[PDB]
Amino acid sequence: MRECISIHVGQAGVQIGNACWELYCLEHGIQPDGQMDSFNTFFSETGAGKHVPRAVFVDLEPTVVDEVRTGTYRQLFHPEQLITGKEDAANNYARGHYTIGKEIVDLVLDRIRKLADQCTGLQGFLIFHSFGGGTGSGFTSLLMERLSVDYGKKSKLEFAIYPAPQVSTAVVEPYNSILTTHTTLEHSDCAFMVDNEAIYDICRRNLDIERPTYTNLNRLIGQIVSSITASLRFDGALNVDLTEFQTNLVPYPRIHFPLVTYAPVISAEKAYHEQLSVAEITNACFEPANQMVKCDPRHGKYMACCMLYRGDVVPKDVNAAIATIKTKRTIQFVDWCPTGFKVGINYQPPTVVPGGDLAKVQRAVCMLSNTTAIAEAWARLDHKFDLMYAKRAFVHWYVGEGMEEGEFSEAREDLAALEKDY
């Protein structure tokens, strides 16, 4: 026995946390109130037939928190773990990092500290947020360094909604993205991808949902986190811990930004049309378009590859499929990283939702790597930042939060050094 803590900041973070808790509740049979020992990794035993999520819901705006506290799962969540803000940063990293974040970071730090107090087997921290959101950038970053300074070497996992190259809710998104990336770089143990446009494209072409909604995105995150945490929440042939995830993909602290991909995303009518075998599902998932990242991995080199099989998957078939994956030349690896393969097998089949896009299947695989194509996105973001900051636009907004342009500039050069480190 062991536990983990999930952190949700901003609208995207709150929605993601709610969806993930919906998964964890329906997978273990939790009714909306909390009733009917691996489920203790995310829920706490007190009283009689009771469980509550080990999470904190915080946002500078109370709209999403109000929406959460109006669902049928009010009884499921403790009221005190929901935090309501008053002044949304409005896509401003500095606003949510200094003006409102500094006076509300205390209660959250403080009581996630108790969440660790009753969880002596705290494996790590889960963070869900968005770069585009000013709250989800600033408050998330500051609480990230607060976690680092209050816990030391404790493992921490970040799930960030990176704005897409052509999808941006706010035009000031480069400022928030660069600022948060420079601020939390040294402490970000592992940060993933989310490309909204790639999610929409995959849903429209794979699930063939011409009119999807953010619920599809919500379980897109939900199924990813479920596949990641199945090892901790269910036994398997070779379970994988959170520590090994950062051990394999962080030989150097500078590069800790791996991309994620799921296989498969198939509707029930199309699930009738295809049953999964290891070779086909892996080679489909390794296909660049199947990746939920809008960056072709074949442009650069591959760091490492991690497989997360769940269900009735034969390890020998895994080895054979992975080998025949290796031999083909569409896949290339760095010279000094010949053997960077870790496989995690779990016996728990992926869980379905009623009325969901995904189809109920006994087996699945999670696609886990850090390709060099992320450098393309980083360079494009840096170029956009240079263009839109060259005339110094929207800077006065961050100035009114009380800093001058210097920190913007050296964050730009820090991220440039990160980009050229490849």
Binding site: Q11, P62, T63, E67, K86, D88, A90, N91, N92, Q166, V167, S168, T169, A170, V171, V172, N196, E197, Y200, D201, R204, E210, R211, P212, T213, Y214, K384, L387, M388, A390, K391, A393, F394, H396, W397
Partner: protein, 426 residues
């Protein structure tokens, strides 16, 4: 939460605010008296932004009515939905500036500033959290511009952190309704470059031509202008008032539209706008709107953006469609309108969607954009001001209210610097 207080100046401003209020009563399911009858929880969940908690299951608009004469006062109160306003919000003068900025700002504004500040402070304190303000007035008129300037100055010195927008009505270049209206526009803009965070420029002749041609009406009236105004109204404020998959507010728009503090003038937009025998034959789809987003026909403030360059574009949508179509449409808009767009502001389209469509339309689209086209309007205003100030005509009315020469000189210098900066951006 995020309460917004409405202040209306001038006869046109009062009519516009009233028409807004009936439109909000439609959108939120409020009858002519104030009772709620909406069929969905979404209308009444965020009714507190524009209404207050009234006893007996009622709601009253968070409005402030200001004028220097009670003629339009009585017409508005005796008009439709006149009982939804408490008599206290109606405060009026008895002299009338007579389309003079100096009179309405100093002579008659001296005994109205106390009342307007008292009522706005009462509205601010009686609410939970005042997100911002919205003002309507006409720059062509003299009194309304003076009230606009005085109120923006008092708000800036009282609530410097609370942003707002001003929906001023710039006089039409083609018609000189008032001889001394260039002075009014001069002083109003000189105060707007200084006391207003962002401003939308609403020009008469453009909406007149839209009602004439796009709507195909042979008898355009002030009613249709107020209707389209109320559509702009709802289009901007629906993201805050109604739930959305991409929630937004006036603060988001202000952050996305203001690159420099003095560069804050934008030109609002609405679509689709089609008649009975075209709507049943037109395509009720996004492309029919994206061909309507960028056009000099359905165009709001009479200066063509094609001559200039767009600064950035904001697009709010209300209906039932997916989001990726909007993103690819915006990308195509860039691809084809690259020359008309600015090269050094990539992806300058601000994309947000409100889930709830307006009453009677399953889409409406509000085009919030900024272009250097207003440079032509400002330059023409400046040259007109120079033309009839070189002759020193009609200066006696202003100098009799405590005016001075070089004051107007730094006013015209401020517009000169503003137009020079806009040209430098171009």
């Amino acid at each position: 939460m995020r309460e917004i207080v409405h202040i209306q100046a001038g006869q046109c401003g009062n009519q516009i605010g009233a028409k807004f209020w009936e439109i909000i009563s439609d959108e939120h399911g409020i009858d002519a008296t104030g009772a709620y009858h909406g069929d969905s929880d979404l209308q009444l969940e965020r009714i507190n932004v524009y209404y207050n908690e009234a006893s007996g299951g009622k709601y009253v608009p968070r409005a402030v009515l200001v004028d220097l004469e009670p003629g339009t006062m009585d017409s508005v109160r005796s008009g439709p939905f006149g009982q939804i306003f408490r008599p206290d919000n109606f405060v009026f003068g008895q002299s009338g500036a007579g389309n003079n900025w100096a009179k309405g700002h100093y002579t008659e504004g001296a005994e109205l500033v106390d009342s307007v500040l008292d009522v706005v402070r009462k509205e601010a304190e009686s609410c939970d959290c005042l997100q911002g303000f919205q003002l309507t007035h006409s720059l062509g008129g003299g009194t309304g511009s003076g009230m606009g300037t005085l109120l923006i100055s008092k708000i800036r010195e009282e609530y410097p952190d609370r942003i707002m927008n001003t929906y001023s009505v710039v006089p039409s270049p083609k018609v000189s309704d008032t001889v001394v209206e260039p002075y009014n526009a001069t002083l109003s803009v000189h105060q707007l470059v200084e006391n207003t965070d962002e401003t939308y420029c609403i020009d008469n002749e453009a909406l007149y031509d839209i009602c004439f041609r796009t709507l195909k009406l042979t008898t355009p009236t002030y009613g249709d202008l107020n209707h389209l105004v109320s559509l702009t109204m709802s289009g901007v404020t629906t993201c805050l008032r109604f739930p959305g998959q991409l929630n937004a507010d006036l603060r988001k728009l202000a952050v996305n539209m203001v690159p420099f503090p003095r560069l804050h003038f934008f030109m609002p937009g609405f679509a689709p706008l089609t008649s009975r025998g075209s709507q049943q034959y037109r395509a009720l789809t996004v492309p029919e709107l994206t061909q309507q987003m960028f056009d000099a026909k359905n165009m709001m403030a009479a200066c063509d953006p094609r001559h200039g360059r767009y600064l950035t574009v904001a697009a709010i949508f209300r209906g039932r469609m997916s989001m990726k179509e909007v993103d690819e449409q915006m990308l195509n808009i860039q691809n084809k309108n690259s020359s008309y767009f600015v090269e050094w502001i990539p992806n300058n389209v601000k994309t947000a969607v409100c889930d709830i469509p307006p009453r009677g339309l399953k889409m409406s689209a509000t085009f919030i954009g900024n272009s250097t086209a207003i440079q032509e309007l400002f330059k023409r205003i400046s040259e007109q001001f120079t033309a009839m100030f070189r002759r020193k005509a009609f200066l006696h009315w202003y100098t009799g209210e405590g005016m001075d020469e070089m004051e107007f000189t730094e006013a015209e210098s401020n517009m000169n610097d503003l137009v020079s900066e806009y040209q430098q951006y171009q």
